[model samples]
Target: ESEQSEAKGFVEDANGSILFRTGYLTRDKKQGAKDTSSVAQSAIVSIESGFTPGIVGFGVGVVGDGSFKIGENKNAGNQMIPKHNDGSAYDHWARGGGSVKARFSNTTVRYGTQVLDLPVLASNTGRMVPEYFTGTLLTSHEIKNLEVVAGKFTKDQMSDQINTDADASGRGLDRAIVWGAKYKFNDNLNASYYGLDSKNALERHYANVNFKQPLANDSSLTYDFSGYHTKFDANAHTYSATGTVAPNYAADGIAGEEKTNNIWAISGTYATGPHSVMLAYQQNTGNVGYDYGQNADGFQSIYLPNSYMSDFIGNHEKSAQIQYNVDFGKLGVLPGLNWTTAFVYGWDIKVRNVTDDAQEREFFNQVKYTVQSGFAKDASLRIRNSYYRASDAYQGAYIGDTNEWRIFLDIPVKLF
Candidate 1:
């Protein structure tokens, strides 16, 4: 089908939306200085124009977001909002960006500022506002059961910052090339492959496969597998604002020494009625742990199943997790309520130049509710909590014992 041929004119098909978000986060570190907590609220306005009437159509999209501090900044740096030079949270910050797009048949090309959602590069939407990238992208769906994507991003705006920069996660990101494709072999199976190459930083490749088997009595089994291979360049080192090398990049504070890492994870889930049970295992190989989204990559780039308070991507790490979830709506009541609980344990973390192996564990729980009717039909509220602990040998290297809590409320309205 020709998408441009069906255009209804730009002004007639235009649409817009406003999303209101309030978020709160608290973290109590067992061994750190003190517990930190903060709250913030944000509003995002998005507008999009329909394709103009023509064989080749044109459109435009714009997004504007603003965040305001909602509480005292006595103990700032909570990442809910940007910080000031005086080490306090900013009173308010705002940014806006847009894109120009052209469409032909089943293919579209867009340029300017946007958020990405792919295996190798995705925006950080876990904060008050999502991260943004300035680049050009092409997407095509000319073939049935197949999708192709390609793009190159040259600049980025962090979730907490108002200015666009050529760096993220400490690494220089003058050029970032990303491409991927997904193929659906059948209704029950599909697979995807993606690659990312950031000049002077790192090169990574990701692959995933998923399959579902329908069982008897309203039950089904699903299997998912994903993995990554990364190689760091000699100039891949990162530096802080003070011109000192970032220590977290390398276990021993020496970058580029351990240049390669391989990691993979697989999970199986069984679901019947409104209940689901999942079991997953993951492992990492090489001298250093898996690193992504920090080195000029997207924050949500990691697709491993054991991701929680900790990514479980330690050096030569082994991990496992058990998770359970329930949808209360399926019980004929509470039409928009859900709850989940999970536990994960990881061990055999071999830090570079460290003798003893370290270990870690986490307990997580979340509850979410959405208004199913009334004027605020889609308003949602979510509460998430986690208890994370690490062995003494792993404390300073990666993370420490802590209790984390996050709460979010969102309401969206449409305008045409």
Candidate 2:
């Protein structure tokens, strides 16, 4: 199949959009630690051009974002907002990047800045803005039912910072090599495997399996399993505003020693009518807790069942979770409203050099509403809350008790 022969000119097939997001996050630390809060508004503008008409199609893409402080920054130090040396927040920050792309047959190659959502090295978008990386990526769909991808990134741009520097050493990133493949066995089954090798930092291998079984009367059962195996390098160094530093694997017990960990989660969900129920379990085995997103790398890489205000992760940790979801529309109540609640409990947590076993738990809730029609159609509002508590043994080692709230309003608009 030749796609270039059917290619549309770049300008004729161009698409542009703008996204507006307003977010507010607050956390109250129960262990006498400083409470932190932040309010900010962010906007993302993106332009994508269609491939040019030719044997080998060419195109271009541009993406930019900006975040502005909303109200008080007195409670600064939020990673959502850029901060000064004194921990004060910057009034505003912005960054932009562009990409050049070429397509041949069923494969495409792109170079420049982009957001990745791979199993091993995903960019974080849980804040005001998403992190960006400078890299080269190749994606191919030559084989039926399969998709292959590979990437090499050399620069890191955190969500809050405007610089593409990975560290003070000017080495941006020692180098991040990422590769993955996804195959759909059928409409009801799919699997994916991905890997990442971040030089001097860690090597990670990730896998996912998803299956769905259709039942009667608008009901179905789904099962998902995801896991990661990571090996850390004792000599890994991370660059920061202050200077170069070694990664501290405190939860695993060995601060700067080579270590290996295997973390995974499995979940089953049943849905019927307006209600859905889910049961999940997660475990961490190895010398340390599961660690990813070093210094802002792959922050959103964890697709686990017990990730909330707390990751519910530690060495030899085991966690169980129960969640329920309701769709108001299905009940003939509200058309675009939904609610989700979940509880997670973890036990058998053991830190490398710590003596006692630790336990922790969290209760989480979230509600979201979208305007179905009218002036605000397509706009959505979401509110999230979580309460987490851990045993005293985890106080200074891993996590502490805390309550958190995050709210966001998002609107997307297309520009022709």
Candidate 3:
């Protein structure tokens, strides 16, 4: 329990700006020569109000979207759409949450239903409203170049829908507690570690390190390395075993065990003037892929927009990525126009003892232009496209040759 007085208000303005944004996206998949399409639209409105000079702040936000299919099956059971027990149009509910932040010296704490955006455990903003968790978060910068974080969450609502009891039990998510810290050792070195404990499973640990340094007069390079490991104690085996799906099975018939389930990756970034390039390699050494509880399903992981690299779909998989980005302003061209392109390929993507040999690949590209010197200075437009393909053994037909495209435009107006 906390003793701090509850502060409340309708957020009107912070930094003298009102925020409004909307987006539309379309996705099509071609599997075994068949095609399926999905369309979605989303809108978001948020406000941040300053209450006590520079010490206290409050915020409220709402987000929602229409229905769309996510996947389909080659045989039965429509995996493309969200289904309720009654079998109706999975019309999702709107999500709204509020937060209060207090700054004391160089530390602050926020409590309420909100999105968490740390590297270890970040909120998924790919869909509408993003995944919100009821929890409290604390951050402090008392030590130079060091930040600490700790939080406990009780419930998770994905896109405003709660998970079923059975699903929640599978991932061992009766409750969740997470704590982590990030420390910057110097100008070119930093590290982070996190510990997660779900009520029904063993605690998990995650660690990462980053290094950046100048290689040339006009070019700089950086590297990132991270890994996750879990240890299951006596309390973790209380749950019943859920059998594994086909195309990914071990001789023991366990998808993952207290002895398996780990992930690791290494990446590098290079920048020189208007152009930047990146490369990465990742692997899942454990028998099982990454797990983050059922309620927080898809909430934790390294799935990034345009990430490609097979999206970490298989175990014992190795993936590589090549990316390029250009800024028009640096080239002395149209100032606000920028473009980025990336390609990822994965191989050796098979389960430990699965008879089928499978692999996955993907390509992604994006372009955006922000009007920096015109009437639309505060408005921006973006276009993104991607293609993903997987092998047949892992039931990749559901995702098949997936294609996605999105266009986004945002404008802000002041009403003070």
Each model's C-alpha lDDT? Answer: 0.81, 0.81, 0.57
- Model 1: lDDT equals 0.81
Output the TM-score of candidate 1.
0.93
Alpha carbon RMSD to native, model 3: 6.1
- Worst-scoring 10-residue span by lDDT in model 1: 237-246
Candidates ranked by TM-score: 1, 2, 3
- After superposition, candidate 3 runs with Cα above 4 Å error: 1-19, 31-36, 49-93, 101-103, 160-173, 230-259, 291-300, 303-306, 373-375, 412-416
How displaced is residue 34 in candidate 2, in Å? 1.4
Candidate 1 per-residue lDDT over residues 20-40, each given as its tens digit: 999988888975546777788
Clashes of 3: 2
lDDT of 2 by residue, 1-416 (tens): 66667787899888998889999999888757778889999998889999998779999999889889988687854467887767688999887799999998888899998878887888778888877788899999889889999999888776767677542222356688999999999999999999998887788899999999999999999999999998777655321111122345333323465767799999999999999999999998876567565533466888787898788767778999999999999999999999999999999887444543789999999999999998778999999999988888776565577788999999988886
Query: Which stretches of candidate 2 lie above 4 Å from their native place?
Result: 166-172, 237-256
For every candidate, C-alpha RMSD to the true structure in Å: 3.2, 3.8, 6.1
Ranking by lDDT: 1, 2, 3
lDDT of 2 at 181: 99
The candidate, 1 or 3, that scores higher on lDDT is 1
Cα lDDT tens digits for candidate 3, 56-154: 433433322233333332211212223465644354434546666665555667776666766545665654345566667888877777888887766
